[PDB]
Amino acid sequence: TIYHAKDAVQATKPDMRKPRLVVFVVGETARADHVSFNGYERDTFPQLAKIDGVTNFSNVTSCGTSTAYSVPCMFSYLGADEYDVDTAKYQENVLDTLDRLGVSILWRDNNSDSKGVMDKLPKAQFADYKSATNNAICNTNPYNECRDVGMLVGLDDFVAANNGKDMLIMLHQMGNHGPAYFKRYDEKFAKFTPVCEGNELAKCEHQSLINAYDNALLATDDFIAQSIQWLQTHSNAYDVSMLYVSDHGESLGENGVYLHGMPNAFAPKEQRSVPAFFWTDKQTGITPMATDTVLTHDAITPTLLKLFDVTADKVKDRTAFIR
Ligand SMILES: [Au+]
Ligand SMILES: [Au+]
Ligand SMILES: [Au+]
């Protein structure tokens, strides 16, 4: 392991103040320009709009355009300019640091896996929610596809087992992951119709493609809102907060480009312009940065450290999502 945060210290501990419980939703394939709050022509995010204390960040750029590239960068100390995907697995990352300081780290996954991020930590702290062995919400659609909302089921038991400790829970979403946007949501979120149902996105009627994509966003709005609602049930005993950031955007036929993964050197804007949301309870003392702060995935690591009152010289000056 190559360390950059051996100086990390927690200024206040959970035995001397309210313990902190945070959910970080690691989003998948969501575009900033398809969010209602960013100026989109459709109400793709209605449930989040009914919750007080949610900050929408209108200017967030992802480290890259693929899950394998972006996800390790999101938890890196190095920042996008110095990040190396091929050696990321051997670097101390922000979750290693928090775990060493006693924060209880949980990673649930309905996407694929942590892309290296969890590899140094006990495997018991990673759980696969793509399979019904763990996910109880798969039989809600004709595909028997495990849903993101299934990752909230049983978190109270996790909280009960970590009673009184600081907790950081990562929920790695399937979210809008393609090309089969139409399989990413249940019938209740099929509001924009008709929808594209083929793997050849270029042959699908363009409007029908956008419709399927936006319906999947409604399913993600629902999931994020339910994550906040779950946190709201522990607001008296814990300082609760929720961070959402998508790993990268998506092309939907602009200049003939579909799906994601374009090399950063010529990646279109829509593959790197991502939504981010931050929610916190009024008691936590956490203050969001301005909604239009120029932000990137580099802000995630300092946000997570600040949420748990942790300092580290490597990201001392780095802009975060919160003050
Ligand atoms: Au669009
Ligand atoms: Au992704
Ligand atoms: Au179109």
Per the structure, how many domains does the chain have? 1
Distance CA 145, CA 184 (A): 8
User: Which SS3 state, helix, strand or coil, does residue 246 take?
Assistant: strand
Count of all residues that appear for the chain in the document: 323
Cα gap 124→22, rounded to integer Å:
19
Q: How far is the CA of 242 from the centre of ligand 2 (A)?
A: 20
d(CA 276, CA 151) in angstroms, rounded, equals 20
Q: Does 52 count as an annotated binding residue?
A: no
Q: How far is the CA of 206 from the centre of ligand 3 (A)?
A: 5
Strand partners, 288: 322
Residue located via tokens 């966003």: 217
Inter-residue contact 273 to 254 (CB < 8 Å): no
Cα 43 to ligand 2 centre (Å): 23
Q: Are 241 and 307 in contact (CB under 8 A)?
A: yes
What is the C-alpha separation between 162 and 268, in angstroms, rounded?
43
CA of 270 to the centre of ligand 3 (A): 15
Range of the domain at 292: 1-323
Is residue 93 a contact partner of residue 77, using CB atoms and an 8 Å limit?
yes
* Residue 34 assigned ligand-binding role: no
Q: With CA atoms as reference, report the closest residue to 251 among 70, 72, 65, 74.
A: 65
Contact indicator for 85, 73 with CB cutoff of 8 Å: yes
Cα atoms found within 13 Å of the Cα of residue 202, Cβ hemisphere only: 4
Whole-number Å distance between alpha carbons of 121 and 253: 40
C-alpha closest to that of 225 among 242, 237, 213, 212 = 242
Q: Across 273-322, where does the E strand assignment appear?
A: 276-280, 295-296, 310-311
Residue with tokens 């799906």: 259
Q: How far apart are CA 194 and CA 2, in angstroms?
A: 51
Tell me the ligand closest to 176's alpha carbon: 2
Spell out where the chain is interrupted, by the residue before each break (C to N > 2.5 A): none
Residue 210 CA, ligand 1 centroid: distance in Å: 7
Q: Is 96 annotated as a binding residue?
A: no
Listed residue (2, 1, 4) closest to 305, CA to CA: 4
Calculated CA dihedral for residues 116, 122, 128, 134, nearest 10 degrees: -170
From the list 94, 102, 76, 100, the residue with the least C-alpha distance to 20 is 102
Look up residue 147 and give its DSSP letter.
P
- Beta-carbon contacts of residue 118 (< 8 Å; ≥ 6 apart): 95, 105, 107, 125, 126
- Name the one residue in this structure whose structure tokens are 């103040």: 17
Phi, psi dihedral angles at 231 (to 5 degrees): -60, -35
276-280 and 239-246 beta bridge pairing: antiparallel
The Cβ of residue 287 has, within 10 Å, a number of other Cβ atoms equal to: 9
Instruction: For tokens 């998948």, name the residue.
Output: 28
Q: Do residues 151 and 105 touch, judged by C-beta distance below 8 A?
A: no
Task: Count other C-beta atoms under 10 Å from residue 45's C-beta.
Answer: 25
Asked whether the beta carbons of 168 and 106 are under 8 A apart, the reply is yes
Q: Residue 249 has which token pair?
A: 């955007």
